[PDB]
Amino acid sequence: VGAXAXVXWXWXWXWX
Amino acid sequence: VGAXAXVXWXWXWXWX
Ligand SMILES: [K+]
Ligand SMILES: [K+]
Ligand SMILES: [K+]
């Protein structure tokens, strides 16, 4: 849990 | 739904 790549909030593919 | 900012796969804070 923290910052980097995977899932959660930020930049990439999913929902606005 | 698609690319840009929000929730889902990619970079920023969460899990992975
Ligand atoms: K992430
Ligand atoms: K999106
Ligand atoms: K995201």
Report whether A13 contacts B15 (CB < 8 A): no
Structure token digits, residue A11: 């930049």
Interface size A-B, in CB pairs within 8 Å, comes to 67
Q: What is the resolution of this structure in A?
A: 0.8
B1, B4, B13, best to mutate vs chain A, most A CBs in 10 Å: B13
Cβ neighbours, 10 Å, residue B10:
21
Q: Which residues of A touch B7 (CB under 8 A)?
A: 8-9, 14-15
CA atoms of B1 and B16, how far apart (whole Å): 21
CA atoms of A9 and B12, how far apart (whole Å): 6
Cα B2 to ligand 1 centroid, rounded to whole Å: 16
| Full 3-state SS string of chain B | CEEEEEEEEEEEEEEC
B2-B13-B10 Cα angle (round to 5): 35
